[PDB]
Amino acid sequence: DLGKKLLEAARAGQDDEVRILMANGADVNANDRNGVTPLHLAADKGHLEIVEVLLKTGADVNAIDIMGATPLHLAAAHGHLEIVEVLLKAGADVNAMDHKGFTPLHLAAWRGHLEIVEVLLKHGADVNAQDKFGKTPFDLAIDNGNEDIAEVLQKAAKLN
Amino acid sequence: GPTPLPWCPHLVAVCPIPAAGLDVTQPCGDCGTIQENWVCLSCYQVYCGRYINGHMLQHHGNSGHPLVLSYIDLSAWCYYCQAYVHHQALLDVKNIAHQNKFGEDMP
Ligand SMILES: [Zn+2]
Ligand SMILES: [Zn+2]
Ligand SMILES: [Zn+2]
Structure with missing residues (x-):
C-alpha cells in the first residue's frame, strides 16, 4: 500500500x-x-x-x-552526472548490462554525455562491451553524431 | 538463447497491421517524443522507449501486449521473453514500416 x-x-x-x-x-x-x-x-x-x-x-x-x-543505466542515459557519481560510489556495477546488451557506457556515449563517459571509464567501464547486435559504445557514439565521445572511447581502446 | 530469437511463444498474440498502416515519424502517445519510439504489435499504439520515459514499458505493464517494433531499427522485442525476436510472422509488418521509412523493401 x-x-x-x-x-x-x-x-x-x-x-x-x-x-x-x-x-x-x-x-x-x-x-x-x-x-x-x-x-x-x-x-x-x-x-x-x-x-x-x-x-x-x-x-x-x-x-x-x-x-x-539499473539506476546507473538511467542516470547515465539522462545525463545526471551527480547521481552517476553517487551511484558508482554507492557500489553500482559500472559494466552492468541490460537485456538488450547496453552498459551505462553504451547509453552515455549514445546520448552525447561526454562528462559521464570519462567518469565511467575512471570506474572501470568496459570500452569493448557489445550489445546483442555487436555494437560498442564507440559504435553508438558514431552513429548518433557524437564525434567527441567517439574519439575518447577510441583512444581509450588503443592504449597499449 | 541466440541473440535474435527465431521463435517466441507470444507471436500468436501479434495482431494484423491496421488499415492505416504505420507511421515511423509518429510521436509517443503520452509525451510526444520523436526520438526513441516503439510500436505495439497488438494495438499499434506508439510510446517512447525505456530510456526516454518508459511509456511503452508502462503500456506493456497495463495492457499485457508482449511484442513491440522499434521505429529506430525495426527490431522486435518481447517484454516477456526479454529478448529480441524474428520470425516469418513478424516479417510482414516490418515491410510496412520499412517502405514507410526508406521507401524500399527489406532484403
Ligand atoms: Zn513517452
Ligand atoms: Zn498495446
Ligand atoms: Zn515471447
Missing part, C-alpha cells in the same frame, strides 16, 4: 512525501509490476536528494527491472 505511493513520490520529486511514506515504514525497496524501484525513478528523473536518502535507507543500488536497467 505504501510502496505504491513511495514509487510515485520518487517520480514526482516529492522530497517531502518520500520522507513521509518511508518514515511510516514504506518499503524502501518497493516494486511496481515491472520491477522499477523508487531508486530507479529518482535516478531517471534526476532527483539527487531522493537518490541520496533512498541509498542511505538501504535502497538496492543494483536493483533491476523487467528490461535489466
Whole structure:
C-alpha cells in the first residue's frame, strides 16, 4: 500500500512525501509490476536528494527491472552526472548490462554525455562491451553524431 | 538463447497491421517524443522507449501486449521473453514500416 505511493513520490520529486511514506515504514525497496524501484525513478528523473536518502535507507543500488536497467543505466542515459557519481560510489556495477546488451557506457556515449563517459571509464567501464547486435559504445557514439565521445572511447581502446 | 530469437511463444498474440498502416515519424502517445519510439504489435499504439520515459514499458505493464517494433531499427522485442525476436510472422509488418521509412523493401 505504501510502496505504491513511495514509487510515485520518487517520480514526482516529492522530497517531502518520500520522507513521509518511508518514515511510516514504506518499503524502501518497493516494486511496481515491472520491477522499477523508487531508486530507479529518482535516478531517471534526476532527483539527487531522493537518490541520496533512498541509498542511505538501504535502497538496492543494483536493483533491476523487467528490461535489466539499473539506476546507473538511467542516470547515465539522462545525463545526471551527480547521481552517476553517487551511484558508482554507492557500489553500482559500472559494466552492468541490460537485456538488450547496453552498459551505462553504451547509453552515455549514445546520448552525447561526454562528462559521464570519462567518469565511467575512471570506474572501470568496459570500452569493448557489445550489445546483442555487436555494437560498442564507440559504435553508438558514431552513429548518433557524437564525434567527441567517439574519439575518447577510441583512444581509450588503443592504449597499449 | 541466440541473440535474435527465431521463435517466441507470444507471436500468436501479434495482431494484423491496421488499415492505416504505420507511421515511423509518429510521436509517443503520452509525451510526444520523436526520438526513441516503439510500436505495439497488438494495438499499434506508439510510446517512447525505456530510456526516454518508459511509456511503452508502462503500456506493456497495463495492457499485457508482449511484442513491440522499434521505429529506430525495426527490431522486435518481447517484454516477456526479454529478448529480441524474428520470425516469418513478424516479417510482414516490418515491410510496412520499412517502405514507410526508406521507401524500399527489406532484403
Ligand atoms: Zn513517452
Ligand atoms: Zn498495446
Ligand atoms: Zn515471447
